[PDB]
Each structure stands twice: as structure tokens, then as C-alpha cells.
């Protein structure tokens, strides 16, 4: 009745199996394409990603891998790579270094409480934080310099 690769009521449905760039499928007796395990799409040319792979930041060419776009990492490829060499900072988007309370700047390696951490004012001076690794030494009588050391 039906010729090779022709199926259906009046043999009007065409299907010839493929295992290439255009598809990874066999054919059923209704003339529909049955994707090979790990293949997706009406033509089975697209690969099924690792269960949980990020739709925007992760892609496929082999099942079930989850390769990453520059600036993204992890199994599910959902975590940003912070800017090198980010210390006390995190990211929302790639190459970001968002400091917490209290660090700066850019790499979040510069102290916002440099006075509390280091006590740079000597010989009875007063320290007050003025920014990332920045301080102010208010010196008593007989003492000068950036740390009241002269």
C-alpha cells in the first residue's frame, strides 16, 4: 500500500529518519518523528539541556550538558562570575562586585571602618573614617603628620 517513508490513511504523511544537524529522530507508523533520547523540537535538531539549565544564561548542542555564557557559572548555569578579584562583594549580573556593610570600592577590598580595624592615629590622635581605606587623624599638641607620628 504505502511506499518507503510514506504513512497515514492515504500514505500522505512523509517521514524518513535522521541522525544529523537537521534532526535526531526515527519514524512512527503514523508518519510522525520520534525524537531520540535527549533531543527536542518538532524536528529533534535541538538538544535537551541538563535538568534546570538557565534558559537565558545556559545553552545546548549535546544532551544533557549545560554550557555557560561568559560571566556565568555553575551546574544550572544561574550564578554570575564576580569581577576579578572581588573580595567582600557579590553580584547580580556578571563582573560586578557589590560590597556589604561596610566595604568599598570596586573590588570591595578597601575598608570603610579603617579606624576600627587598624587604629592608624598614633601618640593620642583621633581617627574618623572618611571612605574606603581613607581616614582622618586629628592630632594633639606637639604632634603632626598623617598619623600623628611627627
Amino acid at each position: 500500500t504505502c511506499d518507503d517513508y510514506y504513512y497515514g490513511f492515504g500514505c500522505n504523511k512523509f517521514c524518513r529518519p535522521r541522525d544529523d544537524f537537521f534532526g535526531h529522530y526515527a519514524c512512527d507508523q503514523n508518519g510522525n518523528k520520534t525524537c531520540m533520547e535527549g533531543w527536542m523540537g518538532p524536528e529533534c535538531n535541538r538538544a535537551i539541556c541538563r535538568q534546570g539549565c538557565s534558559p537565558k544564561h545556559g545553552s545546548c548542542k549535546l544532551p544533557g550538558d549545560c554550557r555557560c555564557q561568559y560571566g556565568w557559572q555553575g551546574l544550572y548555569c544561574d550564578k554570575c562570575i564576580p569581577h576579578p578579584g572581588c573580595v567582600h562583594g557579590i553580584c547580580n549580573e556578571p563582573w560586578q562586585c557589590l560590597c556589604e556593610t561596610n566595604w568599598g570600592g570596586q573590588l570591595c577590598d578597601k575598608d570603610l571602618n579603617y579606624c576600627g580595624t587598624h587604629q592608624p592615629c598614633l601618640n593620642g590622635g583621633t581617627c574618623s573614617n572618611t571612605g574606603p581605606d581613607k581616614y582622618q587623624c586629628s592630632c594633639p599638641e606637639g604632634y603632626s603628620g598623617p598619623n600623628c607620628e611627627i
Partner: antibody
Amino acid sequence: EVQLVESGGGLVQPGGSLRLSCAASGFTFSNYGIHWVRQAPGKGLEWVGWITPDGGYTDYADSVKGRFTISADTSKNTAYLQMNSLRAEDTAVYYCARAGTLFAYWGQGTLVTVSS
Amino acid sequence: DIQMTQSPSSLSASVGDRVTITCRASQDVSTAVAWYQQKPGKAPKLLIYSASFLYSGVPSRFSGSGSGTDFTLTISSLQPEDFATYYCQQYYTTATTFGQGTKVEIKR
């Protein structure tokens, strides 16, 4: 893990016949397919042909067409290659590879030597 | 009946050398190109697929580039265990075609 083992290869008289088996394991056999790639001594890789276990479809290279027949058995998880009218040109290491994997999984290969 | 042509046929390089093997397709085959490493007496081992995608477990020193008709394989820093016959392959059609091969020898 995915395992493909080729058996059957040996000395065959020219014009003779030989059947090779590709014993697959570690995956759902019906979900993929099997390809056959041969490599003549000191020569490159040559795709002999392929089979869908689901449906029973076959395709061959023009070099092996008519003489070579590829078959399968989902219940044994084995694909076969019946070689007939064996020419000297057929002397090669015959490998079987899983379909739908961009040729990531190959077997160790079996040696078919066509000689009097 | 697409043809895959590799260049060079053979090459000798020292450890740490950048090795470049080229492959030309007779027709346009998009990114449907794979690269393999074959040690004599062993089955070919997949290195690169989709012309530029590194297969799992393959050292990062192996990379691939190309789209259309010209494809290249790169071994950034050659190692002593990298001696083999390398093959490019097209899977634009189910009846896959392979390049003749490129032998890589290690100088010392």
C-alpha cells in the same frame, strides 16, 4: 555507563560472508540507533551505515550498498551487520557507534580480514 | 556526498607548542563539524563538536573554530600524550564524512 562491544570479526575467504554483532548496554536501546564505521589498515574512517531500532529503517554508503545488510534486536540490545560478496577493500576494523550522540560513544572495534 | 579535506597531512611539534590543524568542507556545513583524536589500535575519541564546543573530559588545551566551509582545531600547549591521527567530521548529512586525518608527532 554506555557500553558498545563489537564481536564476530575474523578471517573470511574473498566473495564470502560474515556477520558482526554490536552488543549495547547502559542505555535504552529503542531510544537511539546504531551506526557502523570501518577503518582499513593505514587508512581513514569510513561510514558503512546506520539503523533505527524503532521502525527498522536502514541507510548505507554507496560502497557497501547491496552487499551489506544492517539489522537490530531491541530485546537483545544488539545491532548486526551482515557482510556479503566480500572484496579485499572490505578488510578493516569495524566499529559501532550510538546514534543521537554526535559520535561520543564508540565500541573497541572488531577486525574483519578478507583473505584466501 | 560532502568531502572533508585536512591540512597538513602530518606535523612535528615540541611540548608547549601551539598546533593548528585545518579542515575544508566541499560544501557549506554550518557548525555541523566534529574533531576526534585517534591513538593507533584504539577507537576515535571525540574532542570538539558543534565546530566550537569542547566535549566533557577533554583537556581545555584543545579548542575548535569555524563556520561554513573552513574549520580549525587548536592545541594551545602541546603535551607528550597528544600524539595521534586527528580527524574532522561533517554531520550536516546522516551519511557522515571524515577528513583523511592529520598525524601529530612530538619533537624532543
